[PDB]
Amino acid sequence: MDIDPYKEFGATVELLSFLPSDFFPSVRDLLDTASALYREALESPEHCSPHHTALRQAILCWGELMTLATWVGNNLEDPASRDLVVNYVNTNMGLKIRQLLWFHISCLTFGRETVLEYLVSFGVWIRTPPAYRPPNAPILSTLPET
Amino acid sequence: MDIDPYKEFGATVELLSFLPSDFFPSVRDLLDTASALYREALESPEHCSPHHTALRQAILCWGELMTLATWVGNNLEDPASRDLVVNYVNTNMGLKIRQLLWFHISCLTFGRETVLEYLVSFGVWIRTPPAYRPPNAPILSTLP
Amino acid sequence: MDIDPYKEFGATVELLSFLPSDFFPSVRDLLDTASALYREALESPEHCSPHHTALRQAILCWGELMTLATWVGNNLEDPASRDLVVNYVNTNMGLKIRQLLWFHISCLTFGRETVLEYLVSFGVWIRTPPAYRPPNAPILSTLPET
Amino acid sequence: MDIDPYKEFGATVELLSFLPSDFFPSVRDLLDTASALYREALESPEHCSPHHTALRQAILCWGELMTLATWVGNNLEDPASRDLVVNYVNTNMGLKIRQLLWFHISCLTFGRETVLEYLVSFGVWIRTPPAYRPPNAPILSTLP
Amino acid sequence: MDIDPYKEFGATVELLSFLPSDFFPSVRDLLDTASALYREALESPEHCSPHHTALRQAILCWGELMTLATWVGNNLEDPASRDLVVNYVNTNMGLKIRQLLWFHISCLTFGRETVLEYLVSFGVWIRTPPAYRPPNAPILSTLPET
Amino acid sequence: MDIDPYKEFGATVELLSFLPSDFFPSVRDLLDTASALYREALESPEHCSPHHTALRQAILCWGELMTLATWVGNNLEDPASRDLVVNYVNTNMGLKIRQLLWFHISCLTFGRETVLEYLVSFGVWIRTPPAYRPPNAPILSTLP
């Protein structure tokens, strides 16, 4: 139509595409982070922030894709096709699900503004020549003192 | 963690299960009604309501599954497997997307309280044995 | 002794008997309606209304009868007797459990008065000759407007 | 859904399990004590207390199981199966009815707080190894 | 170092040792008492009293020892050693875990002072010659009236 | 009942799982740091904080498991079984004791909020793919 999923958050899929693809943690790890942090936050009968709302749907999405991987693994004779599809679920669609979970999860943990600033800083920092950039890549601030 | 998608909206998947699987319109239809009613509402830089937000992730999801179907059509050569899998995307996984789309779309066109009393009243209309069922089922409408 | 279960609710077993037996939904369906509507309502450490209180006990009753169906199915050699009893659990005792769940469940969903009025209206409507009754049978009102 | 029957009354089935199975009086006895103490209270057109309400469903239930036993006696011809099943109604399913009846009947004769401190104090009396157990167990009474 | 577990509660391991070892209920029974009484009390994201705090850790301790009994039962060929260790877990370490659960559980149910007074009274009562002590041993008071 | 040990402290075992198993110092080290910092705090007739209380049960526990290891060394004669079991006490069961000790010890040296933002920030440092990870990991310190 189309509808950019981050547009309501002051971001774009092109803004998330600014970071290298070889950046977002595998979806099992993000899910692990969510369950560790916001399980009771999500399983509650109320939207807290739009970020939660987006996040639940994202997780249900990966849950449906996981169900798909199970059915495809269980119900196909050809191994070349079954392997190509089960691998496609995580390699291609998994990049989008990865950035999707990662964006809201970071947005809850730090803030929308902090993540936006981060996408910018890392997007620039990776693009700069090694000689003229700060020695270590930017990370997400939490408790930096004494 | 389980997290019921409707739980934030005062519902449960058990509440949606009251409706028969042969009830929700094909996803293409919900999408068309969505674009017809709430398109500018969705393509907005500001998030309007929680329903819009849930809805957008729903739509983007279905778009991703459609991309999966196109990719399955272009990549796989054998027709038995590609036909079994392209069908599993539409018939099986499509139900979950259908229920969500219908739930928010209807919540938007009428309201949450209307949709909920509706799920209950429809629950009564469906639970009734056929011999004693009213000639017409309840529907949502603004007149009525 | 005896104690009519609905008497505290301003009703009678004879009042529920006014409706045809071929009316109440099978118990799995009622349970489905309960779990869909009042799971969190029932699993809470407090009686909300007497209707809840009656309802929990009713459900525990059907749970005991279901346990009975399992033991009878698992622990008998004769198939004629095992089938006759397992069928008797739902056919005969199941009518009473059906009306029992249905009455409180409707009483919560609409109101005691609304259900009483309904038992009356349907009890009359089924008894009237087809020519002189409204074309469609009464149903339980919820949201009838525009 | 699981819903513990005593949960609304500030108890759990785990709390009742503190009492041994060889503790609750046969259901006929509870019924007799019930009719002796609270019969007019039960046959009342007005619901008195939540305990009465839970109690009535309990009694009506046991009456239904008794009807089941009579029907099993009249319908089945073979004695091995009818004797195994008529016994399963009294010995096995009867325990759950026994605990409920005893719990409310006792809650009525004394009170909830008395019944609860009782379940605890009895829990202590039973948990104790026999060598160190008091000559007499705790009981409920109004004097004492 | 050492740290007496009851010292913060106004007690000592020597104070618990005052009672005969053949007194504390087997750990499955104590756990049963805990789950019956304080399941919702313990599974809550807050320390209520230090007694709860001690108690959770005690239960996790017995849970680890139970896990140990499972691994030792499952992963050893020699039966004399496997039986000697699996029996040692409950016989020796189980006395300490028993008194540990029992002390806090009683401390919650009655009070710290009531349990201290009880350890004293029973410790004396068992030590007195039969002729000159009260006929029945002391028990933990709860609701003694009419 | 499950009861997560950290749940009372605003954490979960899932929150501690963010740290790799090859992260927590051997239990002897935590104990030594404990005696070095909070020994008089622990040997006190008054309970100071919930962390101290949880900590003492943790320490007494590990002491009991160490007694178990000594007893296994003195009782068992066969070396295959005694070596397999004495090792299972240190490597396997030791992890759970390690996490608890480290969690409270660190909560004491710095504070709960510091430890929690730490578990999160470390979660970010670890979740990152190696190619893009910062040259140094976050640590707790009072300067910094």
> Among B83, A50, C125, C96, which Cα is nearest to D60's?
C96
CA distance B95 to B101: 10
CA dist E6 → B61, C110, E9, F52 (Å): 57, 57, 5, 13
Residue pair D134/E137 in contact (Cβ under 8 Å)? The answer is: yes
Quote the tokens at residue F22: 């090859």
Please provide the distance, in angstroms rounded to a whole number, between the alpha carbons at the two ends of chain F: 41
Please provide the distance, in angstroms rounded to a whole number, between the alpha carbons at the two ends of chain B: 41
b/e E10-48 (16+ beta carbons within 10 angstroms → b): ebeeebbeebeeebbbebebbbbbbbbbbeebbeeeebe
Q: Mapped to the 3 state alphabet, what secondary structure does chain F carry?
A: CCCCCCHHHCCCHHHHCCCCCCCCCCHHHHHHHHHHHCCCCCCCCCCCCHHHHHHHHHHHHHHHHHHHHHHHHHHCCCHHHHHHHHHHHHHCHHHHHHHHHHHHHHHHHCCHHHHHHHHHHHHHHHHCCHHHCCCCCCCCCCCC
Residue listed under structure tokens 């919702």: E40
Q: How far is D9 from chain C (nearest CA, A)?
A: 7
Please provide the distance, in angstroms rounded to a whole number, between the alpha carbons at the two ends of chain A: 51
Contacts of D144 in chain E (CB under 8 A): 144-146
Closest by Cβ to F142, choosing from A29, A138, A146: A146
E141 contacts D128? CB cut-off 8 A: no
- Give chain D's length: 144
> Among E136, E30, E140, which Cα is nearest to D133's?
E136
Q: Chain A window 58-117: which residues touch B at a Cβ cutoff of 8 Å?
A: 58-61, 64, 67-68, 71-72, 75-78, 81-82, 84-85, 88-89, 92-93, 96
The coordinates were experimentally obtained by: cryo-EM
Residue listed under structure tokens 């002794």: C1
Q: Which residue of B has its CA nearest to A88?
A: B68
**Where is chain C broken, named by the residue before each break, C–N > 2.5 Å?**
none
Contacts of B134 in chain C (CB under 8 A): 136-139
Contacts of A44 in chain B (CB under 8 A): 7-8
Q: Torsions phi, psi of A143, nearest 5?
A: -135, 70
Q: Chain D window 7-66: which residues touch E at a Cβ cutoff of 8 Å?
A: 12, 14-15, 17-18
Instruction: For E12-142, list the strands marked E by DSSP.
Output: none
CA distance E81 to E37: 37
Class of the domain covering F1-144? mainly alpha
> Among B94, B42, B101, B39, which Cα is nearest to B66's?
B94
Question: Domain limits of chain C?
Answer: 1-146
Q: Which of A2, A44, A60, A76 to mutate to test the interface with B (most CBs of B within 10 A)?
A: A60
Residue listed under structure tokens 């004394």: D110
Q: Which residue of D has its CA nearest to E144?
A: D144
Q: Which residue of D has its CA nearest to C41?
A: D3
The DSSP 8-state label assigned to residue B45 in this structure reads S
Closest by Cβ to B85, choosing from A45, A58, A85: A85
> Among A111, A108, A29, which Cα is nearest to A62's?
A29
- Left (φ > 0), alpha (ψ -120 to 50) or beta: where does C24 sit? beta
> Among A90, C8, F53, D131, which Cα is nearest to E50's?
F53
Class of the domain covering A1-146? mainly alpha
Touch C-F: 3+ C-beta pairs under 8 A:
no
- Left (φ > 0), alpha (ψ -120 to 50) or beta: where does C10 sit? left
- Left (φ > 0), alpha (ψ -120 to 50) or beta: where does D3 sit? left
Closest by Cβ to D39, choosing from C1, C43, C54: C1
DSSP letters spanning D14-78: HHHTTS-SS-SPPHHHHHHHHHHHSSTTTS-SS---HHHHHHHHHHHHHHHHHHHHHHHHHH---
Is residue E106 helix, strand or coil?
A: helix
D2 contacts C43? CB cut-off 8 A: yes
Cis peptide before D22 (omega within 30 of 0): no
- Provide long-range contacts, Cβ within 8 A and 24+ apart, for A87-94: A88/B68, A88/B71, A88/B75, A89/A65, A89/B68, A90/A26, A90/A27, A92/B71, A93/A65, A93/B64, A93/B67, A93/B68, A94/A26, A94/A27, A94/A65
b/e D65-90 (16+ beta carbons within 10 angstroms → b): beebbebbeeebeeeebbebbbebbb
Residue pair B61/A57 in contact (Cβ under 8 Å)? The answer is: yes
Residue listed under structure tokens 């913060």: E8
CA dist A77 → A83, A89, B72, B82, B86 (Å): 11, 18, 16, 12, 16
Is residue D132 helix, strand or coil?
A: helix
Q: What does the longest C-alpha to C-alpha distance in chain F come to?
A: 53
One-letter amino acid for residue A45 of the chain: P
Residues contacting residue A133 through CB under 8 Å, at least 6 positions apart: A125
Contacts of F15 in chain A (CB under 8 A): 36-37
- The alpha carbon of C144 is separated from its chain's Cα centroid by a whole number of angstroms, namely 24
Quote the tokens at residue F41: 């705090």
Four-CA torsion B33, B35, B36, B38, nearest 10 degrees = 100
Quote the tokens at residue E23: 């007194």
The set of chains that have 3 or more CB pairs under 8 A with F is A, E
CA distance E93 to E104: 17
CA distance F63 to F56: 10
Is residue A10 helix, strand or coil?
A: coil
CA distance F118 to A143: 7
CA dist D86 → C77, D29, D79 (Å): 16, 19, 10
Q: Which of A35, A98, A115, A143 to mutate to test the interface with F (most CBs of F within 10 A)?
A: A143
> Among E51, D65, D125, D42, which Cα is nearest to C5's?
D42
CA distance B17 to B116: 13
Contacts of C146 in chain B (CB under 8 A): 141-144
Is residue C11 helix, strand or coil?
A: coil
The DSSP 8-state label assigned to residue E18 in this structure reads T
CA distance A62 to A27: 8
